[PDB]
Design a protein around this ligand. Structure first.
Ligand SMILES: *[C@@H]1O[C@H](CO)[C@@H](O)[C@H](O)[C@H]1NC(C)=O
Ligand SMILES: *[C@@H]1O[C@H](CO)[C@@H](O)[C@H](O)[C@H]1NC(C)=O
Ligand SMILES: *[C@@H]1O[C@H](CO)[C@@H](O)[C@H](O)[C@H]1NC(C)=O
Ligand SMILES: *[C@@H]1O[C@H](CO)[C@@H](O)[C@H](O)[C@H]1NC(C)=O
Ligand SMILES: *[C@@H]1O[C@H](CO)[C@@H](O)[C@H](O)[C@H]1NC(C)=O
Lengths: 184, 74, 311
């Protein structure tokens, strides 16, 4: 709008003033400088809006993906929805956009232990089903990887495969049998 | 001449007048360019931005760190 | 494998008054009656220039802290010396980052080349915190606090995430370490030889240089006037008759500047689509293990490592 008040080479920026004090033969040679100028001012506006409307169409395609995958589900993609492990998300509507409240799970209060790839019992290597082998200085436990919940080592949380010679770092420890003590 | 002085300092992006150089490193407040940032801490100061707090995980071939709590972040 | 993505391009800033007129007061006075075409072009070329410093932030600045690898390098047989920074060399770039930097501010008619905010010695220090924190922690440093874990043990999680048990690694740990070492060893040879490996980063530089050459090499065109030099038109023409000839170069050079800015706005949106995919590939493949097929490599993804290239 602010560029409707520019000569663009003409004598004036008002079509009424040019038509009033110019003859028809040489009024047209001053209107064309405004026709060309105001046309070029509308093309550079439409062109930048075509580019600007393709930026929004990429955020409106990312917002529809974040709604389908994080609001209508639980996402495994890293840093897609929040900084942490995704739990759930809530949409809130803003005037010309959307706001996502990403509920995540952040671990905290970590303490360090001593691990072993396997545990050699009865001459057989034992690997855990789900979790890790950890030692609190003296005793060995099987705990889940994302939360310290140690458990004694039995044949229900470990699976045996191979011998004790091939693994590098296998330790000697007992794997308690859940049913032998209660036999008869 | 909008106002050449005594705090003349030469940057790679240009050369900066009115801000003093300090040998510390802070988080970037106002980006100047080529790793130089400026901030107000009282006079204007110009330093080299700090990427982040230094850290060194205590790696060992038989040690793991397992969290004992958690936190819910929105 | 290796995937090369461009994340940013050169930050140029062309000024109209010096480009279109070039120290002529008569020419410059004729230019204010065209309104604000050139407050627009400076504003457009500045939005492009501040994007290139946001494209780099979102790709590399993924880590809160700067993690360090331990001085003793015993990762169970795996050998990371080809991606880890080289202490001896002055710039601290790893042996593979050196090939990527040897395989790929000029004064002119108003052209300026602003420097990037993050120097290449700061980009190559984000990539050694993202890479020395994924060796000693795993994916645990992209979620919360970094949690140490032995590499032959955090590489048995990554077999366990593709449907292969932990036996397959601990029983074949020495064979897998050799396959990983030799695979990294052949990555340097493919980049050193085959003088088209980078490719994608070069075409971005060549297209940005062709654009500036066409802009400068069009300051010597008549556009209908009698001469391409303002001084000649002013010197040997009576002022009211030189007014019409200057206006022909004004409209010619103002159109040669608009098509340059227009194609840079279109080109800057291609890089932002590749600077957004590299931030997604860093978050989902470097800071974790991806189940998306063929997103990171041709196979069952295990892990990924970032190396910095000039752009
Ligand atoms: C790791 O654990 C040992 C004892 O188990 C302890 O002495 C050491 O300080 C720990 N390292 C840390 C917390 O970085
Ligand atoms: C380790 O765990 C065992 C079993 O609960 C317990 O008896 C012991 O006090 C703990 N601490 C040490 C240092 O052994
Ligand atoms: C860990 O490294 C030490 C040498 O620092 C070595 O004696 C020990 O056997 C290693 N442990 C494993 C499980 O490889
Ligand atoms: C900073 O270091 C320079 C040389 O490295 C020294 O001349 C100067 O005194 C130091 N302190 C300040 C405040 O610049
Ligand atoms: C890693 O490989 C390089 C050869 O590329 C070799 O010089 C180096 O010694 C290896 N690392 C170790 C710890 O031996």
């Amino acid at each position: 709008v602010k560029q409707l008040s520019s000569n663009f080479g003409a004598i004036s920026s008002v079509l009424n003033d040019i038509l009033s004090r110019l003859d028809p033969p040489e009024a047209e040679v001053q209107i064309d400088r405004l026709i060309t100028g105001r046309l070029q001012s509308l093309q550079t506006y439409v062109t930048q809006q075509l580019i600007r409307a393709a930026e929004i169409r990429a955020s409106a395609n990312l917002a529809a993906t974040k709604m389908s995958e994080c609001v209508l589900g639980q996402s495994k993609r890293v840093d897609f929805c929040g900084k942490g492990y995704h739990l759930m998300s809530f949409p809130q509507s803003a005037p010309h956009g959307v706001v996502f409240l990403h509920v995540t799970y952040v671990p905290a209060q970590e303490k360090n232990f001593t691990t072993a790839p396997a545990i050699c019992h009865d001459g057989k290597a034992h690997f855990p089903r789900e979790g890790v082998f950890v030692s609190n200085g003296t005793h060995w436990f099987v705990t889940q990887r994302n939360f310290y919940e140690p458990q004694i080592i039995t044949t229900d949380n470990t699976f045996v495969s191979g011998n004790c010679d091939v693994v590098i770092g296998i330790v000697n420890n007992t794997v308690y049998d859940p049913l032998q003590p209660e036999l008869d | 001449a909008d106002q050449t002085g005594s705090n003349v300092f030469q940057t790679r992006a240009g050369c900066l007048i009115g801000a003093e150089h300090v040998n510390n490193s802070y988080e970037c407040d106002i980006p100047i360019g080529a790793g130089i940032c400026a901030s107000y801490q009282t006079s204007i100061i110009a330093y080299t931005m700090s990427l982040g707090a230094e850290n060194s995980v205590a790696y060992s071939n038989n040690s793991i760190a397992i969290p004992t709590n958690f936190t819910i972040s929105v | 494998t290796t995937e090369i993505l461009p994340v940013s391009m050169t930050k140029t800033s062309v000024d109209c008054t010096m480009y279109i007129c070039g120290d002529s007061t008569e020419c410059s006075n004729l230019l204010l009656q065209y309104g604000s075409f050139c407050t627009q072009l400076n504003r457009a070329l500045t939005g492009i220039a501040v994007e290139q410093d946001k494209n780099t932030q979102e790709v590399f600045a993924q880590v809160k802290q700067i993690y360090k690898t331990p001085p003793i390098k015993d990762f169970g047989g795996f050998n990371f010396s080809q991606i880890l920074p080289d202490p001896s060399k002055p710039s601290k770039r790893s042996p593979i980052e050196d090939l990527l930097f040897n395989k790929v501010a000029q004064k002119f008619n108003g052209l300026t080349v602003l420097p990037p905010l993050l120097t290449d010695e700061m980009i190559a220090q984000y990539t050694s915190a993202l890479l020395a924190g994924t060796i000693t922690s795993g994916w645990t440093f992209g979620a919360g606090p970094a949690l140490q874990i032995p590499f032959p043990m955090q590489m048995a999680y990554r077999f366990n995430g593709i449907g292969v048990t932990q036996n397959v690694l601990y029983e074949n740990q020495k064979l897998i370490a050799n396959q990983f070492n030799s695979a990294i060893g052949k990555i340097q040879d493919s980049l050193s030889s085959t003088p088209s490996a980078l490719g994608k980063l070069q075409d971005v530089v060549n297209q940005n240089a062709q654009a500036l050459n066409t802009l400068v090499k069009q300051l010597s065109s008549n556009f209908g006037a009698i001469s391409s030099v303002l001084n000649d038109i002013l010197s040997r023409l009576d002022p009211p008759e030189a007014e019409v000839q200057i206006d022909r170069l004004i409209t010619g050079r103002l159109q040669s500047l608009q098509t340059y800015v227009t194609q840079q706005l279109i080109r800057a949106a291609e890089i932002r689509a590749s600077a957004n995919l590299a931030a997604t590939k860093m978050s989902e493949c470097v800071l974790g293990q991806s189940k998306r097929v063929d997103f990171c490599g041709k196979g069952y993804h295990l892990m990924s490592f970032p190396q910095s290239a000039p752009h």
